Design a protein around this ligand. Structure first.
Ligand SMILES: N[C@@H](CCC(=O)N[C@@H](CS)C(=O)NCC(=O)O)C(=O)O
Ligand SMILES: N[C@@H](CCC(=O)N[C@@H](CS)C(=O)NCC(=O)O)C(=O)O
Ligand SMILES: N[C@@H](CCC(=O)N[C@@H](CS)C(=O)NCC(=O)O)C(=O)O
Ligand SMILES: N[C@@H](CCC(=O)N[C@@H](CS)C(=O)NCC(=O)O)C(=O)O
Ligand SMILES: N[C@@H](CCC(=O)N[C@@H](CS)C(=O)NCC(=O)O)C(=O)O
Ligand SMILES: N[C@@H](CCC(=O)N[C@@H](CS)C(=O)NCC(=O)O)C(=O)O
Ligand SMILES: [Cl-]
Lengths: 203, 203
């Protein structure tokens, strides 16, 4: 597995997964501050100009390498290939995938806008900062509400849903989120932080 | 299938799919202007307070009903259940799913911010409107570039990737997008508009 990577929340999703399974991989660093993500060779693999992306040179089918962009798609592909971190039971699987989709469609995109507008003086973008601050709070509340019910996000076991959420939730301080308002999220963060693969990916 | 629905881009994704397959469904209208999405009975099904959501009372397993929120998760679940609009070949499937994820994580979320900031006088939110206008252009360019290469989004056949994108791309005028800049997108919109299920869902 070739992983096109930068040390960002979306990059860490994939190294978390790979470190949990112990699947060999080669990191191809993409310097997103340098614009490496716009180079033609990268766009061939990842036409949306974003990391992460992978190339699997040993697809189950044999044959041509398979390239994939979108962290959610990569997680699903790898979970299917390895049979790890995603249930094969339709009910459990569907719950896990619902929360994966919730992460890629809402948690990541909106917290990312929160990150973006924190690059401005607040007085300069008052409507935007209010919008994304309030939405960040709503998202953490949704997350906390689920984690009050189940030990992991939509289930009894660590899954790709949790792997997708963790690198974003780990950044709560940058999002100006008061984690004391979300005690179940706090305990879940603490729990995932103790996993050796988490420490390895963030080393 | 019970579908919790409003006539919005994300709602139409699901009625497009159901109309293509001819799977019976019951619409449960959720008046999102009235705040129906915050009612406890709805939150039980869709804790993120958004439509669409479904309840499948006849899951393959038999047994308890399965509830699902997130349009991407619903599309995947229904495509798997029916065996329609998503390939069973690993390569084709992976390409389709990559583009599904791209839609739910980027195309929808960012065009939705474009929609939101068009509710303001432009002089009042100059940074936000510029950001989401430029991002909308980037997204249409990515879409157009792919549709120059393949007749449908990541493939030779209409799939859940196309179904996910269409209701958002159909709204280009509202996004202040000049569709003449994206001729492949224009032809693809025209093509999908001719499908009887498209007309049915939008009737
Ligand atoms: N929806 C995408 C988001 C990926 C993303 O936002 N990547 C960022 C770094 S975390 C990136 O490559 N930005 C480069 C750019 O926008 O030019 C995913 O889940 O993979
Ligand atoms: N072009 C991007 C560059 C910054 C970026 O890529 N941010 C990433 C996180 S490193 C993001 O918000 N991704 C959103 C997501 O994951 O959906 C922007 O202006 O926001
Ligand atoms: C490393 C890492 O995960 N950084 C987070 C902040 S905790 C991030 O947002 N990186 C992307 C960015 O700063 O735009
Ligand atoms: N990522 C979600 C987005 C769903 C969404 O944005 N739904 C809107 C209508 S299109 C909604 O229910 N808004 C209600 C609210 O935000 O209160 C999906 O793909 O299903
Ligand atoms: N609370 C939402 C209400 C509007 C809404 O739900 N917009 C939908 C479209 S109807 C949206 O942008 N969804 C984003 C997505 O599909 O990811 C907001 O303030 O933006
Ligand atoms: C109906 C429909 O699809 N409306 C689009 C505009 S073309 C939409 O954005 N609906 C949600 C909203 O106005 O927030
Ligand atoms: Cl699957």
């Amino acid at each position: 597995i070739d992983l096109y990577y930068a040390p960002t929340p979306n990059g860490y999703k994939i190294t978390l997964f790979l470190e949990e399974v112990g699947l060999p991989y080669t990191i191809h660093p993409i310097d997103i501050s340098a614009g490496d993500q716009f180079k033609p060779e990268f766009l061939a693999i990842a036409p949306n100009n974003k990391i992460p992306a992978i190339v699997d040179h040993q697809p189950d089918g044999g044959g041509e390498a398979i390239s994939i962009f979108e962290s959610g798609a990569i997680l699903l592909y790898l979970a299917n290939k390895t049979g790890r971190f995603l249930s094969k039971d339709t009910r459990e699987r569907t719950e896990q995938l619902q929360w994966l989709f919730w992460q890629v469609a809402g948690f990541g995109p909106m917290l990312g806008q929160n990150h973006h507008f924190n690059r401005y003086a607040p007085e300069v973008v008052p409507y935007a900062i209010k919008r994304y601050t309030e939405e960040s709070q709503r998202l953490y509340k949704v997350l906390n509400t689920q984690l009050e019910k189940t030990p992991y996000l939509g289930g009894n076991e660590y899954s790709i849903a949790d792997i997708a959420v963790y690198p974003w939730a780990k950044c709560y301080e940058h999002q100006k989120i008061n984690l004391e308002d979300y005690p179940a999220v706090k305990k879940w963060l603490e729990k995932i932080q103790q996993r050796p693969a988490t420490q390895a990916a963030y080393n």
